[PDB]
Design a protein around this ligand. Structure first.
Ligand SMILES: [Mg+2]
Ligand SMILES: [Mg+2]
Ligand SMILES: [Mg+2]
Ligand SMILES: [Mg+2]
Ligand SMILES: [Mg+2]
Ligand SMILES: [Mg+2]
Ligand SMILES: [Mg+2]
Ligand SMILES: [Mg+2]
Ligand SMILES: [Mg+2]
Ligand SMILES: [Mg+2]
Ligand SMILES: [Mg+2]
Ligand SMILES: [Mg+2]
Ligand SMILES: [Mg+2]
Ligand SMILES: [Mg+2]
Ligand SMILES: [Mg+2]
Ligand SMILES: [Mg+2]
Ligand SMILES: [Mg+2]
Ligand SMILES: [Mg+2]
Lengths: 83, 99, 62, 208, 99
RNA sequence: UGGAGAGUUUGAUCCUGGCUCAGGGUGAACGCUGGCGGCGUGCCUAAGACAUGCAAGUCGUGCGGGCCGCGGGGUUUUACUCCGUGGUCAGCGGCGGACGGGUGAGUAACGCGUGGGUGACCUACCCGGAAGAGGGGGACAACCCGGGGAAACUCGGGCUAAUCCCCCAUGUGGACCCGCCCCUUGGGGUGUGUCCAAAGGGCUUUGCCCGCUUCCGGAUGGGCCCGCGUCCCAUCAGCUAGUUGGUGGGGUAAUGGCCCACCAAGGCGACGACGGGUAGCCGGUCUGAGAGGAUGGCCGGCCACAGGGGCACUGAGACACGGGCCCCACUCCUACGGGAGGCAGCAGUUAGGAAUCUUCCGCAAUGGGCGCAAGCCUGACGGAGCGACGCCGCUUGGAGGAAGAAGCCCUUCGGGGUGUAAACUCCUGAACCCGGGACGAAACCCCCGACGAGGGGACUGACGGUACCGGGGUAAUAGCGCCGGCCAACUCCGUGCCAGCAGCCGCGGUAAUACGGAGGGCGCGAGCGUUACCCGGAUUCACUGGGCGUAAAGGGCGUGUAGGCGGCCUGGGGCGUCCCAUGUGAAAGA
């Protein structure tokens, strides 16, 4: 099915992912439907996790599954909290 | 040496017979019906059509046919039955097809 | 055919050779040079200036 | 890179006194004073009038030798200047002069630009508190360029910052001799440097 | 949108098909001059309503044969046998290019 | 924000005009030389042939068995091996093996690109919604038995379980004919007739978790279609029988001559059909002032292929890279009865070649498949290694140091050059050694809450004892090309149309700045040169931006077809054209 997941960018010993929604069957680094966030696991900058929540929610509501690791990061920017 | 895609092969073979059976059955009956419709034998033409319809639909359930495919089979059968009959006819065994 | 550059050489009837390209305005139908210093083409002895053409190892300054 | 090998021998040839040894190339010695002719068996012969090429080659070489920078680094630095906004000549100097090794010399933490290189490279310099050892490092407006706390009292550094009491440091910079700090305020204007170099001919060198 | 093209009927020798010739003009990619090229389209005419000389809108469609992927939309104007004659002269001239 | 020209035809000149060079670039190769690191990148040839290992599995919470280790006592225990659980083994059954990964052979084509179309269609798993999961039967492996085999294993007879198969029911609904209304290519509705469902598993169990069935909608991924764009030869000019169309079938998810009967005689072509040759196409890339020219390795997207060729099966999907059949080619085992095989997956071998790597580490990360989960698998991937192959960065010292040692070169025998270069004094301290030592990793899971939100806890690192930080600490690799002009840099000796140089002009005949060596210089510098190829220069295919009296170039002249171009005025149209908005122009690159 369609997925919310981490596409690897950046470089060697420089992981910088994009949080992206994409058919599960693409290659990891391949074409994707839409970009929503980016993530830098080493927090080399303060704006190291970003997500467009209002879009991630669109995508979650039309049946995209997120990766464990992606979920964690959407949770952290409160895609999941509902007041 | 061994992979157990061998399994998948063993299995494809079983299904291959399963579907062959349903498919050849569907054609013998579909033929039979159009044949009877042409002879003008409408009680048995419709009788058989119904059986054929059933078997086609039964087949749609799993891999054998699906879709627009069964519908199509059905469509052509009753288009072909209803008309051959209509040349003589009266839809005796009122079963099978709309007034 | 192929030119054998350098003062002196060691090529004979079955010597193996690296051909290079480059003609010689002077020998008609010689479109190629032999690469000295490679396969059976020896370097050029005593050569001290343009040493890397002519496949010549840097001489020892004992 | 940085050449390594005889200098106040191109303090000559360029025929014009660069300052590659800082301190001696001020004594009755930079050989510009003694032997103001090119090196070698010739040098003091009839000067044949220079080709348009040689004119520019020399101008280019002059400038480069001043900062002690490899031609690959130089051309790069230059091609960057060209793409950059407005006057390629002026800008290009500013980029040369923005270098760390050179900033350090302009602060007189070091006598010569060679020296500055060696100081930077050996951990003695610090930019905004963290230590840098990349001579090529680009210095930006507003940066504190200091001398490393552990290096603060080294023979050479006290000597060199002793001479900086007295002197004025180029207008585009500030200096704090007591505390050994410096500030790169702005980029050097084309005139702030009295360079023995018509940079317009250097642009023309790279046009071929 | 379905592509609409207009042009003349230069053949109606086929059953329920008219050959419709479409002129078009583009600037030349390099030399800039406006050039005029033309393509013929087999167009479905299910009611053999269109005749030679008819200028017609042609509309993109569900394939009707190999070749036919355009139905005839409507009739812009009628009996332009001048444009037909033009094409046929161009075609007849070929007889004088061989060996 | 952008554009350089020079040498060579003559006694000399102008023009024409070719040849040649300086520049940039590359998956490179070769020569001389080589110190460090980071990030990239490395079979361009034989889409030749391949030893060996690994590259796709996973579910015991679908099902029944074999074997084992235990618990719990059967005769007290080893001989009839009994219950419970935790392992393993195939089998049956699912989901996956259609993705990921490889390669560029074929393809000049709707293959690709770009924009559209589908009232001509499909989409497993995911999401939203509605309604179900009610009855019955049955067989095949496993397993036992036997015949067969050297074995691979292979046949026969018999047992058997399920989420395996089959029938019946309910029909929320759906399919189909026909009629009606709407809509307008087969779209939506509706009536009667006929036809169609399903599967159970686990727990702490009158409640939860995973599955099963039907329909509707969503999302994602696709198929098919069309406009336009897509190389060289016309010394390839005619091509075409399923050929073009129609009718009725067959086929498919679906249109379609896709396939088949029948009918008609069409269809295509100088706006280049057909044929031959070459080629995967694009984002981009290199070059260029640009317009253009060239290219399409790496990374992304699409296509094609999987020893050559055909074929289908299974399936949501394949005509299937590690599935199947047959033919062909080639190889391997063989007890001569027969068997087995497909690296254009990762490594690697071998051959071909100027030339291109480890049979490395790890699933810690990200992603993928299966599973409730734990977790398993993952040569995708993340890393390490090797190679100056490429780019960026860094070092081989720094400051002082003589009107200036020695050596060596020149010398007008006073000098001059190497050269502040060295020696020498201080200074710093690459490497080294010592101590410490990462980020990348917080989830999944566990507990509170409700197995939601939200709060709390635990595990986890290949790279790596690495990066980096702190503390000690040694003056510590330099080479390559060129010095006749273009082109930056000159003297001496040797040589004497020889040896040799050479990109072009041309140098070499005994004073050679052009050969070879020395000293000296210029240019780059862990590199420098060479060869090859592309663009430039080349306004030398000229759109930008050239020409034809004599330099190459006016057709021997009419007539004329297609075509190209078309005076003055007014109106209509608005195709060209221009404007605005808007969609599209993916990401990466710039
Ligand atoms: Mg039969
Ligand atoms: Mg030479
Ligand atoms: Mg002449
Ligand atoms: Mg070597
Ligand atoms: Mg298209
Ligand atoms: Mg049809
Ligand atoms: Mg199919
Ligand atoms: Mg090819
Ligand atoms: Mg140009
Ligand atoms: Mg092969
Ligand atoms: Mg394989
Ligand atoms: Mg070989
Ligand atoms: Mg040109
Ligand atoms: Mg001309
Ligand atoms: Mg003449
Ligand atoms: Mg003439
Ligand atoms: Mg004439
Ligand atoms: Mg005319």
């Amino acid at each position: 099915m369609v997925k919310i997941r981490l596409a690897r960018f950046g470089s060697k010993h420089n992981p910088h992912y994009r949080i992206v929604v994409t058919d599960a069957r693409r290659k990891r680094d391949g074409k994707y439907i839409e970009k929503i966030g980016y993530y830098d696991p080493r927090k080399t900058t303060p704006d190291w996790l970003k997500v467009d929540v209002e879009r991630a929610r669109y995508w979650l509501s039309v049946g995209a599954q997120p990766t464990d690791t992606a979920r964690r990061l959407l949770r952290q920017a409160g895609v999941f909290r509902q007041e | 040496r061994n992979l157990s895609a061998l399994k998948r092969h063993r299995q494809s073979l079983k299904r291959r017979l399963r579907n062959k059976a349903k498919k050849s059955a569907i054609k013998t009956l579909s033929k039979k019906a159009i044949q009877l419709a042409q002879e003008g034998k409408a009680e048995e033409a419709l009788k058989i059509m119904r059986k054929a319809e059933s078997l086609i639909d039964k087949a749609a359930k799993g891999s054998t046919l699906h879709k627009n495919a069964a519908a199509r089979r059905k469509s052509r059968l009753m288009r072909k039955v209803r008309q051959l009959l209509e040349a003589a006819g009266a839809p005796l065994i009122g079963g099978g097809l709309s007034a | 055919t192929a030119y054998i550059p350098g003062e002196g050489h060691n090529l004979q009837e079955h010597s193996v050779v690296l051909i290079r390209g480059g003609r010689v305005k002077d020998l008609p139908g010689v479109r190629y040079h032999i690469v000295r210093g490679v396969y059976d083409a020896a370097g050029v002895k005593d050569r001290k200036k343009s040493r890397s053409k002519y496949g010549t190892k840097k001489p020892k300054e004992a | 890179g940085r050449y390594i090998g005889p200098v106040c021998r191109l303090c000559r040839r360029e025929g014009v006194k660069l300052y590659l040894k800082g301190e001696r190339c001020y004594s009755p010695k930079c050989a510009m004073e003694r032997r103001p002719y090119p090196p070698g068996q010739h040098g003091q012969k009839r000067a044949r009038r220079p080709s348009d090429y040689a004119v520019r080659l020399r101008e280019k070489q002059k400038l480069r030798r001043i900062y002690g920078i490899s031609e690959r680094q130089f051309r790069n630095l230059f091609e960057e200047a060209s793409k950059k906004k407005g006057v390629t000549g002026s800008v290009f100097l500013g980029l040369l002069e923005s270098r760390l090794d050179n900033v350090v010399y302009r602060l007189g933490f070091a006598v010569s630009r060679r020296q500055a290189r060696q100081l930077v490279r050996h951990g003695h310099i610090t930019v905004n508190g963290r230590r840098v050892d990349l001579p090529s490092y680009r210095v930006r407006p507003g940066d504190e360029i200091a001398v490393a706390e552990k290096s603060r009292n080294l023979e050479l550094i006290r000597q060199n910052l002793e001479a900086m009491k007295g002197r004025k440091v180029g207008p585009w910079l500030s200096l704090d001799v007591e505390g050994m700090k410096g500030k790169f305020l702005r980029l050097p204007d084309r005139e702030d440097l009295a360079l023995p170099v018509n940079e317009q001919l250097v642009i023309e060198f790279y046009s071929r | 949108p379905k592509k609409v093209l207009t042009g003349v009927v230069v053949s109606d020798k086929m059953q329920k098909t008219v050959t419709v010739l479409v002129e078009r003009q583009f600037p030349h990619p390099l030399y800039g001059k406006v050039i005029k090229r033309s393509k013929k389209y087999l167009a479905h005419d299910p009611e053999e309503k269109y005749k030679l000389g008819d200028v017609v809108e042609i509309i993109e469609s569900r394939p009707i044969s190999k070749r036919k992927r355009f139905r005839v939309l409507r009739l812009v104007e009628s009996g332009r046998m001048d444009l037909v004659e033009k094409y046929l002269i161009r075609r007849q001239n070929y007889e004088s290019l061989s060996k």
